Amino acid sequence: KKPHRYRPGTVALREIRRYQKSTELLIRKLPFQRLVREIAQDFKTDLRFQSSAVMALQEACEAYLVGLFEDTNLCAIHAKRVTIMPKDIQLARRIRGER
Amino acid sequence: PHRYRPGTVALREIRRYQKSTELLIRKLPFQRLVREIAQDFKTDLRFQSSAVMALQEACEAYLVGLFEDTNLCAIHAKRVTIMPKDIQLARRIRGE
Amino acid sequence: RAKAKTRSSRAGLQFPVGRVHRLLRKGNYSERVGAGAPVYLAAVLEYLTAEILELAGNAARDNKKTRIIPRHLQLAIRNDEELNKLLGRVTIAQGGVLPNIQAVLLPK
Amino acid sequence: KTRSSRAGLQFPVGRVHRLLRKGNYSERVGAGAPVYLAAVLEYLTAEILELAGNAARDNKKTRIIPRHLQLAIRNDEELNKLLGRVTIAQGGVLPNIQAVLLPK
Amino acid sequence: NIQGITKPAIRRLARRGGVKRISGLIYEETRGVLKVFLENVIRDAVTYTEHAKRKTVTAMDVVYALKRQGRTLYGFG
Amino acid sequence: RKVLRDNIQGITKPAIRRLARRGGVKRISGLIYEETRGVLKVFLENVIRDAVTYTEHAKRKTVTAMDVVYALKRQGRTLYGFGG
Amino acid sequence: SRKESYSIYVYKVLKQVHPDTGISSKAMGIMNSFVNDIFERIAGEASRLAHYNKRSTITSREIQTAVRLLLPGELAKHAVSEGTKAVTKYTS
Amino acid sequence: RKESYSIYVYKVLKQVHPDTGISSKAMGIMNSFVNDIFERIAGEASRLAHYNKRSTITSREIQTAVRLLLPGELAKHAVSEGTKAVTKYTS
DNA sequence: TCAATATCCACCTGCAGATTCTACCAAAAGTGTATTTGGAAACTGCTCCATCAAAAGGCATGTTCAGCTGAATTCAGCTGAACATGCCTTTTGATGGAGCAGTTTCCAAATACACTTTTGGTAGAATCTGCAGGTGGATATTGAT
DNA sequence: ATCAATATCCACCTGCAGATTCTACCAAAAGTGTATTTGGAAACTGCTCCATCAAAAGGCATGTTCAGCTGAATTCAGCTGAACATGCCTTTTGATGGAGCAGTTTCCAAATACACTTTTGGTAGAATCTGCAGGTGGATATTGAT
Ligand SMILES: [Cl-]
Ligand SMILES: [Cl-]
Ligand SMILES: [Cl-]
Ligand SMILES: [Cl-]
Ligand SMILES: [Mn+2]
Ligand SMILES: [Mn+2]
Ligand SMILES: [Mn+2]
Ligand SMILES: [Mn+2]
Ligand SMILES: [Mn+2]
Ligand SMILES: [Mn+2]
Ligand SMILES: [Mn+2]
Ligand SMILES: [Mn+2]
Ligand SMILES: [Mn+2]
Ligand SMILES: [Mn+2]
């Protein structure tokens, strides 16, 4: 009885469905909070954050990366691939006007 | 008899029109297109000549920019020929 | 003194005409504010709120729930053409995205 | 003495103040605000005219024309960002041909 | 009136955009895109013109219509 | 206090994978994780720099949600849900 | 420490369109954000409209033109309808 | 009657390039540019004063607005020249 | 068809979060008067539109074929799937105490307003420099070795 | 890779048409001086939230192995789009009136501002109410097979 194994991509497609059906934040909270405070302290030392300010930043960042990954995915599919690569991200940001 | 190879005249034209600034659509066909589209909103309207020219500048800048983005989309697919699917990708990503 | 009748009542509105007028005055938009401007504006804000709450309520029913959450607002907005353009550059916190998988990613 | 004279500026401080007052931006306008604003506008104008003159020189010409303004703005990192969504009538584009389109 | 935007003019626009080879279906597509653009711009410009109870769309009306679409145009104040 | 360093690495490979899945991505090149970290850091710096500018203007030491909302709005990315 | 919001009005409209349906506070914050955003968009367009025409007053007709500029299609059509109805009822 | 910045842009041109001229179309572009940056800055400063429940736009609002609207080195030099002008004006 | 695995979809109940109620009070409404403004009437130039024509030069068409796009085919190595291990995020909770907000007072800085001086805008006349098109190579390209 | 032949490009030129400056006048804008008011900064202070820390449970990151399947490279042809010659017709250029708009100006009726007073809808918090968070379990669906 050979051990069970899903074919490459079947689990990826399940994950796409599960995560497109949900709305929870997808980055861990505390690491994101430390990233925010690190970047802020390199602008003005000894700043403080309302918790809702950090949560607003996390919502903003996650929406932005999900939108950019949609655009990246269309760029990869355009090149008749299924694997997104840095040149797809770079194309998406050049066309969006972000670089 | 003398004949240039496909693409040599294309690159000559790219250089010539990227060095220049004249409008590239002829004025009267554009004025007629503008007036038709306007007539579909309120007939018997009038245009300052400079208003028609501002429209023409806006349209040409828009299409030239869109063609830069399209050309990059084509090259991304390892082509050198722009196709409608390139235009569509550029506008989908631009949010249009 | 005359019995006080709210401006929203005489306009037939749920949104507060008086507060909208105060906000226009203190928002430094023009030196003067016509009497009709806050009424029209409150009417429009109420109409759009009604549109969105209508569609979001239907979405909450479809998923077998009775309280509207951000996800229902997001589903309502992105599935409606005109709201989706109006709110084209807007992020709905906790809204997620619409299920959509490019066809070429599916197996044969 | 004009306020522009007292600030060491060429741009018109009094006009910037009238425009701030007449624009419904705030009910009051401090005295330093139009001075600061005129200084900033002059500085940016100087930056762009500097670059446009250099570009018009590179092309052996004496009158700055829109083309030199487009060249000046698009070849500079920070101005090109400031004017990112701006169309300069009669400006054309920067000469740029993707490497993969050339022969050899 | 759209067909009056010639194939050669579209090629010229494509060349300023740096395009070397043009598929035969680009031209109709380009016209469609141009048409949407023009309608949107003109729809707003005329609105400004009607608000001012004018019958002549001015250069400033077109500049306002462009600006509100996030496309600032210089040269027509 | 305590020295905060390298927190960009706390955006794990699995978290980036989850975000890409929500974006409909089925297969991810191995170089994508670092690129995503670079792009996220640029985005975050731009938003946080403007939020802090608002915070300094109000002579505060606490970044509020409204500072972040204003910073977002002025960058063309309106966020609903964090007013008041 | 008083803090105003549109919450009560959004809720009255909710009881109008879906009588037995409720709303979570995060969704209420989203609706408040929406009301403030559309208010600013319309007020800003009307302010500019009056400024372009050298007028000092924002009237319902500036609000109307602003509505036509910012809203898409059928949404603008029905909003103009409800705004006209409210102004006409208010005047009488 | 009909205002523009042409005389001032001309003065600044003769400052940085004494021998160079400018066409009326290029001058129109400069006018549109001055009006555009003016509106951006004044509008940000207006929003700033409202956010902080203040009724006066002061040089400190113009400065913050410049820091928000200009990129990097441009913001630094603009804040610099604005501070310079204001201090020179106060005497 | 089968075994393994995952998703789907009702059922259950307590409590965290939402809804309702209550009472205070801040702000809207009413009122009265002062101040600003919009439009009906009457003008006056001045832009645009309608129309016509000559003729210039740009476009439409049809043929040939160069070479590009897409299909077919092959292979190696990367990325996805599965698993163990154990770190560190999440959760819940408490504690100081920073620093927001809330108040009060009072000037530095703003508005108001009368009056005066300067200047930017404007339109014509009087001067200067890019442009028409020419010339003259000169630069690049092409087929042929 | 050179080579001569062919076709388009590009400095260089010069006069002059038209665009950019001299000329001169003047409303409106900017400045000035004086008088009067006021928004907000300073200095307090209460009291929210914010920072930090802890334990402990268990979810999820990490690190590894390894095979399926994907991206990358390569070959080939059929078909599409470039170049070109040709000649016709659309556009450009210019003119012509003159209808009909913009843009102004004046003047009152109508509209809006704004202070004070009265009233009441809106908020904060307390007190009820109640979906749904999670947790559990079978039905169904899908998957990949050897
Ligand atoms: Cl890459
Ligand atoms: Cl296609
Ligand atoms: Cl009104
Ligand atoms: Cl000031
Ligand atoms: Mn640091
Ligand atoms: Mn009270
Ligand atoms: Mn002068
Ligand atoms: Mn020439
Ligand atoms: Mn006085
Ligand atoms: Mn005070
Ligand atoms: Mn493949
Ligand atoms: Mn062949
Ligand atoms: Mn009551
Ligand atoms: Mn559940």
UniProtKB/TrEMBL annotation, chain C:
The keyword Acetylation applies. Residues 81-108 form the Histone H2A C-terminal domain. Its main location: nucleus. Signal peptide: none annotated. Coiled coil: none annotated. GO terms for cellular component: nucleosome; nucleus. GO terms for molecular function: DNA binding; protein heterodimerization activity; structural constituent of chromatin. Keywords: Acetylation, Chromosome, Citrullination, DNA-binding, Hydroxylation, Isopeptide bond, Methylation, Nucleosome core, Nucleus, Phosphoprotein, Ubl conjugation. Residues 1-78 form the Core Histone H2A/H2B/H3 domain. It is found in: Chromosome; Nucleus. Residues 1-8 have a biased composition (Basic residues). Core component of nucleosome. Nucleosomes wrap and compact DNA into chromatin, limiting DNA accessibility to the cellular machineries which require DNA as a template. Histones thereby play a central role in transcription regulation, DNA repair, DNA replication and chromosomal stability. DNA accessibility is regulated via a complex set of post-translational modifications of histones, also called histone code, and nucleosome remodeling. Belongs to the histone H2A family. The nucleosome is a histone octamer containing two molecules each of H2A, H2B, H3 and H4 assembled in one H3-H4 heterotetramer and two H2A-H2B heterodimers. The octamer wraps approximately 147 bp of DNA. This is Histone H2A. It comes from Homo sapiens. The gene is HIST1H2AB. The chain holds residues 12 to 119 of 130 of the full protein.
UniProtKB/TrEMBL annotation, chain D:
Keywords: Acetylation, Chromosome, Citrullination, DNA-binding, Hydroxylation, Isopeptide bond, Methylation, Nucleosome core, Nucleus, Phosphoprotein, Ubl conjugation. Its main location: nucleus. GO terms for cellular component: nucleosome; nucleus. Belongs to the histone H2A family. The nucleosome is a histone octamer containing two molecules each of H2A, H2B, H3 and H4 assembled in one H3-H4 heterotetramer and two H2A-H2B heterodimers. The octamer wraps approximately 147 bp of DNA. Core component of nucleosome. Nucleosomes wrap and compact DNA into chromatin, limiting DNA accessibility to the cellular machineries which require DNA as a template. Histones thereby play a central role in transcription regulation, DNA repair, DNA replication and chromosomal stability. DNA accessibility is regulated via a complex set of post-translational modifications of histones, also called histone code, and nucleosome remodeling. The gene is HIST1H2AB. This is Histone H2A. Residues 77-104 form the Histone H2A C-terminal domain. GO terms for molecular function: DNA binding; protein heterodimerization activity; structural constituent of chromatin. It is found in: Chromosome; Nucleus. Residues 1-74 form the Core Histone H2A/H2B/H3 domain.
